[PDB]
RNA sequence: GAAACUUAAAACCGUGUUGCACUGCAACCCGGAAUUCUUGCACGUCG
């Protein structure tokens, strides 16, 4: 991609998101909208009409 | 016997509280039942 060798840096860092004190933790909202997919494509990718 | 008013004049009047004492008062919960709940991946796309 300009051969031009470049080399980049960080610039940007995403973080994770925390508890109130400053832990990382996983949120139940996020493992439900998993299990809404894992049943949604058994009646999906086993059978269908 | 025929002829001459027991008449005249005079307030049933004057004074006087339907007045004195007396609580529309005593007892009584605007009280008993009721979830601001149900569904929702901070994620997708890379000459």
Redesign the pocket.
């Given at each position: 991609?300009r051969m031009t060798r470049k080399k980049l840096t960080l610039n940007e860092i995403h973080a994770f998101i925390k508890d109130p004190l400053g832990r990382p933790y996983v949120?139940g909202?996020?493992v439900?909208?998993?299990l809404?997919?894992i049943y949604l494509q058994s009646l999906v990718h086993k059978r269908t009409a």
């Open positions: 991609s949120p909202s996020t439900k909208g998993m809404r997919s």
